[PDB]
């Protein structure tokens, strides 16, 4: 059972040169933490860190569209907002009877809409939480100019926030996407990833809503190979998932977390002992030159941190990264910023697969607390990292959404993407419920913050398990 890596929580400077480690010593309490499950229960996680098993009856949240990633329309202090008497989500979305499967939909993504009448409580709303599509939020091709004429096969529209803020009051920051693929999916030319928003106006009357705008997309940042790897270092780099948002710390200012990869060209042997975080008297430290050799120099993940130059939020530059978990995991994904009683939750979204040899943990969201947007973050639950996981056997092979392997929990994917909202509540989208593919949106859950530590609180709604698609406002716009 290995010593977990300390942590002071301390903030710095958002414009210094600090970033914290998620490290193999912290996150190998995950495994530490887990049981042997005791046949026929297939889940080895803490209770208070495991999501209820869904229902394999779920519905789909629209029977015309594969819905995943999903934020809600708020604003730069985290406040989900309704616009009058409605409450709006948008989600990556794609056409289940379009000719390609589930697992092919993230090329075709385009970012929809949906709306529902604000102030009904879940249980006297439909099952399927009554979001109504609006339909594609962008207008075609408006996206795909950020690219030029450079050769592409696709463009996607993929994850990042909504902030109300012109005729326009809505800015969505989002991630631009420009593939060029043989038909076999191997890149003929790396992925190109662009952070950028586009604004446009909300307009609602007692039948609908719906969007005007959204015609001009600016682009904002694109990896520079210093602090985020490029294309050209990884052509697998992960670049995405803009959040936007103000800090009280730092009033004058407008930050932005996202998902990046430490900027190595792939293959370096560039991990350090601070990323193994063991004392150097440690009898029982794992050495640095074998967990390289093991093959965990392919998981670079960290969290990047950005800041707006001008006033209208139309140029940015990036800042060191936040966090990162170098020969950990390949993926922090959908980051966030919670704050919550003057302390700062990152919440960052990862995959049992992406996990370096030697470590191990669920698919879910992962949290680390400090006292700035730039800390010694400290891992939640025993300094573990991890906030709620999907039902799963660590002790058994991973399998796949679309293989799942008959050892392991039939719930190991259930859901992914979960994004905190006011009040702990957490929204996801279903992936796989044994042979049921989802693309629909979860139960909304509801976790207890409380310090260094969380608990899924399962006497919410049914047993834990809140409405389908339950993405509520807390304050009118
Ligand atoms: O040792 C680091 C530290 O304490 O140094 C003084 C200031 O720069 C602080 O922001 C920072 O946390
Ligand atoms: O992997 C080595 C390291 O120096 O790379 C750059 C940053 O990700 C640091 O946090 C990390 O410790
Ligand atoms: O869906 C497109 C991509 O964005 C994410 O959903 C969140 O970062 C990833 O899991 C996926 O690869
Ligand atoms: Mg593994
Ligand atoms: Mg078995």
């Not at 289940?96 to 102030?119: C, L, N, T």
């Not at 998932?241 to 730092?250: E, K, T």
């Not at 193994?276 to 030159?289: H, M, Q, R």
């Not at 693309?439 to 976790?447: M, N, S, W, Y």
Request: charged share 15%; with cysteine; aromatic share 12%.
């Amino acid at each position: 059972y290995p010593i977990p890596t300390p942590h002071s929580g301390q903030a710095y400077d958002p414009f210094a040169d600090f970033t914290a480690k998620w490290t193999r010593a912290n996150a190998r309490q995950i495994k530490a933490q887990s049981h042997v499950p005791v046949s026929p229960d297939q889940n080895s996680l803490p209770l208070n860190l495991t999501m209820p098993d869904i229902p394999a009856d779920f519905p789909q949240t629209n029977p015309d569209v594969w819905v995943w990633d999903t934020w809600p329309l708020a604003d730069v202090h985290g406040n989900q907002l309704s616009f009058q008497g409605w409450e709006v989500i948008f989600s990556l979305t794609a056409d289940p009877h379009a000719g390609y499967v589930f697992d092919d939909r993230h090329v075709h993504a385009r970012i929809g809409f949906f709306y529902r009448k604000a102030g009904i409580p879940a249980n006297q709303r439909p099952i399927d939480g009554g979001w109504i599509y609006g339909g594609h939020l962008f207008p075609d091709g408006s996206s795909v100019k950020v690219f030029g004429n450079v050769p592409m096969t696709q463009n996607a529209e993929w994850s990042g926030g909504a902030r109300f803020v012109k005729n326009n009051n809505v800015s969505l920051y989002y991630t631009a996407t420009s593939f060029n693929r043989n038909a076999q999916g191997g890149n003929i030319t790396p992925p190109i990833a662009i952070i950028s928003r586009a604004d446009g106006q909300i307009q609602a009357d007692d039948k609908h809503v719906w969007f005007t705008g959204f015609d001009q997309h600016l682009p904002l940042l694109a990896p520079d190979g210093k602090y985020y790897q490029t294309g050209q270092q990884n052509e697998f780099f992960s670049f995405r998932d803009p959040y936007v948002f103000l800090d009280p710390a730092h009033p004058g200012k407008t930050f932005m977390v996202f998902e990046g990869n430490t900027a190595v060209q792939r293959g370096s042997r560039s991990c350090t002992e601070a990323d193994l975080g063991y004392s150097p008297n440690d009898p029982n430290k794992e050495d640095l030159n074998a967990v390289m050799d093991s093959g965990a120099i392919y998981q670079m993940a960290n969290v990047g941190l950005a800041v707006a130059t001008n006033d209208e939020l139309t140029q940015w530059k990036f800042l060191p990264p936040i966090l990162s978990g170098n020969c950990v995991n390949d993926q922090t994904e959908r980051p966030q910023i919670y704050l919550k009683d003057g302390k700062y939750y990152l919440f960052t979204i990862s995959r049992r697969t992406t996990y370096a040899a030697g470590v191990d943990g669920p698919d879910g969201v992962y949290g680390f607390v400090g006292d700035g947007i730039r800390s010694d973050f400290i891992p939640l639950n025993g300094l573990s990292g991890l906030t709620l996981g999907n039902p799963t056997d660590l002790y058994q092979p991973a399998g796949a959404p679309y293989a799942l392997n008959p050892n392991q929990n039939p719930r190991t994917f259930q859901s992914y993407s979960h994004y905190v909202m006011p009040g702990g509540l957490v929204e996801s989208y279903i992936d796989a419920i044994g042979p049921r593919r989802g693309g629909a949106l979860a139960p909304t859950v509801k976790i207890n913050i409380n310090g260094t530590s969380t608990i899924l609180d399962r006497t919410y709604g049914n047993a834990g398990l809140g409405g389908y698609g339950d993405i509520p406002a807390n304050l009118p716009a």
